[PDB]
Symmetry: C4
Subunit: 446 residues, 4 copies
């Protein structure tokens, strides 16, 4: 018996009202200044529009809302009328109520047009849409906000141009007005010439060009220009502020990358490192930026540490499920195993593990070739290998001994890292470490 | 015997002085240029205003202040005169002292008007108010500062317009001035036409429009325009800077939210997660933003860790006071218990606790339904439940064993979390853990 | 059989195309408005340019690209045509296709010039270059982006000026146009005068000056100015946003330094420290800023903790290799030793180690003199020394006893710091600590 | 034999050169356009200025500099000539060399004035001063940078005005120039009228007003305005960027404070806390902001942890030196004791320690009254006290028992905090804890 605020009916009703509001807001100054009122072909359409909003006044009592403290619903139509009658009812029933149609049919005009300028309270619904669409996900945020600013700027042009043409009509002596002193016969021309002339006056003093045509002579008009140029100063400052937000935010990523590269280059050229350490640092920052892992670190560390477990369970479980070491290790162990795996990504020709380094982490390959050569003991050649899926670092499992070989990449790779302390934290989950240790003993003895 | 600076008398005295300062600052250029001086109907009011400030000069010796290093008072009127006589006394006694009324009554004028332009030192009190109202809590900060800028801009318009009308009066050959070459008979017109014309000239070169009327011909006036247009360049840059602060600060929250959603969507569409993990991540960020917990985390972690204990004592003590487990647990234990409770809030249909997960935390419901179904062992149906107030996670109290069921939400909930390490930290507070363990044994055996 | 996208041939082919695109984009409005078409001396060059792009349409099928998910290559020409035929093929084959040369040779003009305005789709390659050069390392980032903005601004001036000269030619009554009412005989003048006049009109309404010459009289031209001044408002806001990024980013370092100095001075002058502690704090921040160690800390702590080991191995191994203590300590121990050394840098006259201070760290000198004097027990003189390479702090190795002397610098120095906990972490690497302890015993006994 | 770069002689020599550079840069356009050259009264002064710079060319070989990698000196005049002859020698010896005085005395002019426009290379010294004064401590940073921008803007006005007056002189037909068509007789007027007219033209198109006088008619002049208005667009954007930095940086502190208060008020009014917890949170943030402890925390935690020990040794040693507990505790213990003391500051009426709270920290008063009342057991009245210097919290030294009383402030205080873990860390420093424990036993037994 109560209409939910997420039906397909009510949302299409709102968007039909939004098109109707845009119609009313475009007509109202153009009706206020140029055209007369006694003819009725637009009077019909205005009365129909007032009928639609009078229907909406009734129908907003049947609609549920979303409360702030308790969520997802408010029903039982008490407190709905308390919400609607306190916040938005008074100005809506002032705006919806016809006054010109009663003045026309009762006895009878300028004081009745000002009562028709209250139709602009209907323009809150466009603000409610541009509040919804920023916060909705499935839209470009830097498109909606510039659309909002273009809407406000175009409406300011329109309303100011029509009001100045009004104050040019109502004044005796057509000469010494802004349009009279240039065109001496202007009331006999069409609507398109007068409307384009008023619009052209208004935009040359909004966008602060100000050629020198169409300046003011009438002192009341000379008074209107003071308030309009104050308003244009304020709005132009606001517009430059929004475009500064769009430019600062659109290019933050590339600027932060170039900061990191400048800092690495100053640190390198200060201490005079030869070539190799420079190329390692700069290529490693280039491949941190091509796979943008900084936002990955932040947004993974903002997750509630169970959804990241389901992420790693999707990504790395069939890779860890088939290794040299792990054979029969009881997948209910693997669910608690997988969730601490921290992926990584590595440049080519970066010496990963050097000879006689004290061990720190397991390096499961997921892709990419690896080339191992003797370091210090062997001047050149020798042997060293590992292929997709084939782990290494299995010396420092429990042997606690340094790595035999050198580890230099050939083509780029993706290397998982279950480190030493993570392994020793996995040690207390016993009765399945026996299978791992049997795989170690039968692994190395063969 | 010494007036405190927080009386209701002295604050109303200051605000009466602020209205008097605004009066003096509006009159002084308008008196300096347009009107004469020999008539006395405003001379009376100016002498009365000088009387009020001469009273304030005496009365500021009886008032205490707030020192910088030691707080809350300085009394004993030594060092009050040392403060007042060193900082603000000289220019105040130069500004308050009448010079035109002595020139009028002594013997007698342009050199005496410049001595009346020193009345603008009285305008420090408006700066003191706009320093107080930013730092006071009970006002909108983005309203006060724009009011300050509108005040400075309007006063610049006013003073520049009146000074240019002065330099147009004092020059012989009324033609070849800015107002003379357009209106040849301008000294015979009223005050309102000349004042609106001067104001209209001034605003078309402050807001950089510059139509082309009212340009300068007199070379001293052509010299005045150089300094005024330098000043307008500086002030327009300052105004755009302040509106950039208001726009960058007004929309930081929505922009940060949309950053987080873009980063989550790039991380999802890079690694090709199917649907479910995307919808979990995006709905969890949407319900971190509807209940803005990031500012909550920051401002709770900036608190001195006793007021947050009183906060949690108000919020969660009658909820934890009535549980399945806790029955007679000696509320002086509960005061030390409650202060480490970390609240949280959760989306619907997010699988909270999965089957055979190694346990981490207690999950006391505060609201919201919970639905538990068999995971892996059971393909569908089965049973699992918990209602408002009914805790779960009571397996991993001391049993250290994985959870039996799956835990999926149905409608959204608020779930407290006293985690495993927090429980084991609460273990050393003994002689009341016996009641908890008896409640465990009689709880599970039934 | 497939051309790689990193050959020297294909890159020079692209840059030749970029010069050809700049040629076409400069000619096309200037051809559209000023000159005729029936003569053929430029028609030849345009057909040759269309030939070059028709060659490029074929040749872009033989070129490999870089995929997003898997890196470094895509070969095997399937999916290359799927990439190229879906993204960029349609507008390229619309732009490359000649239509004016077919209109000239088939039967025959304004509707055929608009088909020649589609040559501006060729201007995507300039956007691809200005996307590459920001992300490439070996270029100044704040030079490329301002070059991009100057390019867009100059092209807007050019195209708007030529389009307004077109709409001034095509209109009957040469008077009441923008160039007709000032120059009554303008079609008989040269190209340079008309082109400079159109360019001069366009820039006085792009850069919002607007003298007052050359305003519009024709109502269709009065309509064109509305769209052009809207566009200029948008572009001027965008340009101010980019220069705000350049100014905020160019002076962040000096502003952060001056923040730190202001905060230290307020903390000093609040609590009334005499002189010495002020000069120590301020000189220490000055020598943190002359050797900018903050970016060093950040970018070293962002490194993957093996490249920083190779850095410290290059920088400090021949310094630690020759000390009082270390003599025969088996350089495979030294590789694991060096990587935890944290360098530092110190001001002169800063009291480094005071008398009877509980010990915290080893202080190996690398440069700079050190002067030690008796503290408290000795009023003045006494003795204390250490020279380049000569360590101190060797009391608190295992003796766990306070330092004997005071340590005040004379000229500035660079002092390594292997702290107490780092030494005790190095203790478990035994069978070579015996040599260190023998060097201690024979060191102190002599 | 080598002049140090920090003598009082050489710095005064540099500042005399800076005044001479400002003289040359102001004269050079004004000499280039307005005045003739054959008279000699300024020719003398120019030759003298060239003599001063020819002396400086020699004298810059005797001066030491500061190297980048090794600091504080470079002597031994090899590599000084390598620095000076590579970087700055060529353009200095091109600028210093006279060419007009040789043209005047050799045989003989426009091509020789362009050789005199190379005197503007001498203007690097003003850039070196405005690089030094930002980085020097004893100057306001937001004053120097705005002075730099005003200097560049005024010089742009000056040079552009004089160059346009040159291109107005050199053209035949004095009518159809910018100054000719308004003043038909302008070459017969003085210097002040022509100079003010050129300056007034230049500033109305720098500050984008553009009245409508003084527009261009000569096509070469119409070409000059294009480059000058491009330059003014660029410089106006740069100026707005710098004022945006000054406004964003000048009001960051108050804006951050108001952020914290808005976040606390939203967190309070969301969860509906009654009054008391709101007033505690808001008054505690107000007294974190009146004594700005956030910058204190940052800049103390950036200190090298020995200077902060000397700070706490100056601030708190004679306060801790005289307590209830500590009597004879051997001040060489006190030097290691004091350095971990963390000061704090507290609002009035904030309940500091509640009844039956599990203890956390010692609370030595340094000022401010304290009022203790019974909590829960006692409804009202009771007793509780502590005065300046009199510690409390001495229950939980080793008794590990909750506090007896409640602790509510009356007037604001400053309370040191040596916490529980800091005390237990001080426990291993024995052979003087016996005196503390004797003071405990004789303290409580009395
Ligand atoms: C041709 C006819 C077209 C008709 C269709 C157009 C009608 C659309 C109408 C939408 C209106 C809602 C837009 C809104 O809500 O107003 C923004 C605020 O506007 C300002 O800047 C006002 C600064 C004033 C300048 C100071 C005055 C100086 C004294 C919110 O911006 P926010 O900060 O994002 O909330
Ligand atoms: C019609 C009559 C109305 C009379 C009533 C109005 C009187 C009110 C009067 C209030 C005055 C106090 C306002 C203040 O204090 O001046 C701000 C600073 O102003 C600037 O920008 C000055 C930039 C100059 C431009 C460089 C010059 C270029 C060479 C502080 O701003 P802050 O940074 O927030 O402190
Ligand atoms: C004399 C002849 C010279 C011919 C050579 C010049 C041709 C070069 C041509 C390069 C073009 C690529 C440059 C680009 O891509 O367009 C930037 C975006 O431009 C804007 O600002 C457009 C704002 C519109 C204002 C709103 C309109 C208001 C309704 C990207 O900027 P981004 O943000 O960095 O990506
Ligand atoms: C009346 C006679 C007075 C004579 C005395 C004055 C002589 C002083 C002369 C000082 C000069 C050094 C100042 C400097 O170095 O130039 C700043 C940079 O200037 C710009 O903005 C240039 C933007 C160009 C706009 C793009 C052009 C668009 C195509 C550094 O600013 P920075 O970023 O802080 O380094
Ligand atoms: C002189 C002339 C330029 C005046 C134009 C000013 C407009 C910018 C004014 C006229 C009516 C105003 C609208 C009417 C009230 C609206 C409801 C409010 O919840 C949001 C702002 C809201 C949408 C206003 C925005 C600003 C408007 C559109
Ligand atoms: C050419 C014309 C535009 C000059 C107007 C400049 C004004 C903006 C000047 C004139 C007098 C100045 C005021 C007088 C001194 C005031 C005391 C000081 O503690 C705060 C600034 C303070 C309030 C000044 C602000 C700027 C004012 C109001
Ligand atoms: C009224 C007149 C000023 C219009 C000029 C507008 C120009 C600024 C428009 C005209 C053609 C447009 C270009 C054509 C399409 C181009 C491909 C796109 O991938 C990047 C933008 C891209 C390069 C456009 C940038 C903006 C241009 C250059
Ligand atoms: C059209 C007219 C407005 C041209 C004026 C442009 C000036 C802004 C140019 C003219 C000469 C230029 C100066 C000459 C070279 C100087 C050395 C360099 O290390 C710092 C910039 C440096 C100081 C330049 C700054 C910009 C100046 C002062």
């Amino acid at each position: 018996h109560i209409i939910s605020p997420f039906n397909p009916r009510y949302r299409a009703w709102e968007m039909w009202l939004v098109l109707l509001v845009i119609y009313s807001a475009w007509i109202c100054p153009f009706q206020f200044a140029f055209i007369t009122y006694k003819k009725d072909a637009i009077f019909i359409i205005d009365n129909i529009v007032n009928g639609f909003f009078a229907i909406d006044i009734i129908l907003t009592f049947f609609v549920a809302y979303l409360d702030s403290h308790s969520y997802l619903l408010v029903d039982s139509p008490k407190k709905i009328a308390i919400r609607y009658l306190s916040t938005w009812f008074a100005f809506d029933v002032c705006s919806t109520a016809p006054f010109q149609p009663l003045s026309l049919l009762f006895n009878y005009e300028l004081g009745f047009r000002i009562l028709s300028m209250l139709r602009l309270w209907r323009l809150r619904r466009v603000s409610s849409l541009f509040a919804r669409l920023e916060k909705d996900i499935r839209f470009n945020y830097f498109w909606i906000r510039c659309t909002k600013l273009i809407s406000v700027t175009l409406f300011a042009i329109h309303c100011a141009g029509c009001f100045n043409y009004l104050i040019a009509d109502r004044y005796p002596n057509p000469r010494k007005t802004w349009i009279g002193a240039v065109y001496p016969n202007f009331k006999e021309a069409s609507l398109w010439n007068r409307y384009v002339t008023a619009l052209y006056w208004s935009i040359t003093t909004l966008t602060t060009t100000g050629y020198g045509d169409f300046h003011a002579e009438n002192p009341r008009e000379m008074l209107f220009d003071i308030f309009f140029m104050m308003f244009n100063l304020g709005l132009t400052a606001y517009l430059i502020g929004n475009m500064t937000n769009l430019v600062v935010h659109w290019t933050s990523r590339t600027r932060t990358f170039r900061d990191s590269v400048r800092a690495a280059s100053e640190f390198a050229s200060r201490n005079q490192l030869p070539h190799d350490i420079q190329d390692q640092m700069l290529s490693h920052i280039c491949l941190k930026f091509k796979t943008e892992g900084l936002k990955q670190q932040e947004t993974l560390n903002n997750l509630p540490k169970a959804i990241r477990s389901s992420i790693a369970n999707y990504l790395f479980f069939p890779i860890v499920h088939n290794i040299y070491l792990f054979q029969g290790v009881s997948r209910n162990f693997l669910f608690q195993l997988v969730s601490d795996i921290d992926a990584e990504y590595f440049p080519p020709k970066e010496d990963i593990i050097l000879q006689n380094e004290a061990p720190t982490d397991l390096y499961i390959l997921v892709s990419g070739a690896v080339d191992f050569t003797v370091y210090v003991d062997g001047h050149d050649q020798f042997q060293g290998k590992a292929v997709i899926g084939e782990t290494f670092g299995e010396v420092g499992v429990l042997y606690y001994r340094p790595q035999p070989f050198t580890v230099r990449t050939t083509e780029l790779s993706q290397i998982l890292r279950i480190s030493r302390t993570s392994l020793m934290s996995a040690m207390h989950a016993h009765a399945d470490d026996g299978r791992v240790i049997m795989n170690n003993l039968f692994m190395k003895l063969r």
